[PDB]
Swiss-Prot record:
Modified residues (N6-acetyllysine): K142
Organism classification: Eukaryota, Metazoa, Chordata, Craniata, Vertebrata
Glycosylation sites: N114
Protein name: Cathepsin B
Location of this fragment in the whole protein: 79 to 333 of 339
Disulfide bonds: C15-C44, C27-C72, C63-C129, C64-C68, C101-C133, C109-C120
Domain of life of the native organism: Eukaryota
Species: Homo sapiens
Active-site residue list: C30, H200, N220
Amino acid sequence: KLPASFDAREQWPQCPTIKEIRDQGSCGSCWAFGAVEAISDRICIHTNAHVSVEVSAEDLLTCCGSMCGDGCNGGYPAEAWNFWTRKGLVSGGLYESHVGCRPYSIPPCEHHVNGSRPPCTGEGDTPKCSKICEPGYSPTYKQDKHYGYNSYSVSNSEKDIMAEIYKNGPVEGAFSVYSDFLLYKSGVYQHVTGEMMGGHAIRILGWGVENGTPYWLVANSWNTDWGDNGFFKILRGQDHCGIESEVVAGIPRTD
Ligand SMILES: *C(N)[C@H](CCCNC(N)=O)NC(=O)C1(C(=O)N[C@H](C)c2ccsc2)CCC1
């Protein structure tokens, strides 16, 4: 039933957020980024491109509080999606973009690569929850909220995750980062060297096969000069680095 390859960017060509790579900056907010990116995609898919917006990482990062975790010091993706169902999320684009209600306040940086931006440092402070949109944006904060119908776990099964993406759009997942992952440029990632650095949340938007190796198509939040234009591929079908073990998703309410 499922195709040998699937790419959400090809399936939903009128949904620009699916193609977009963000930059979490010097802040451990991957849990938030994986969520708002997939939510942005799912709102566009759910409306057949009639509503296409960058959902605010700032809003999720700053305003969830204890139920999600500890802001820039890590969080729980499951409860990020739950926050979307309970209190909703406003719009917000990239740093100094002036796009949406609450654009990201933490500046971009170079994540384990050379480039013109400053080098990323450790976990910076979590910004305050400010329930007010930026100057120049309409409508108001309350009026700009987008809500989810539900949030749920996807089972630790390759085919179930594929089915979920195929039907309902990109999902959030998490995997264990080893030091060799940081150097990723292209191909299918499999862990071959290096120690455990910690967990990392990302957006899964498809799958395929390359030179006989099955993979998941993943968006990272380390800007576009990391990896393969901000994306990477990782081995699919063996719960590699736990990539199939913490997938989470949710369906939008209609605005
Ligand atoms: C994502 N960037 C974040 C790593 C931040 C570490 N920064 C750094 N300088 O090393 N990781 C996460 O958000 C996850 C996590 O580890 N959460 C922990 C277990 C947590 C859960 C509840 S409170 C803290 C990995 C996916 C979630």
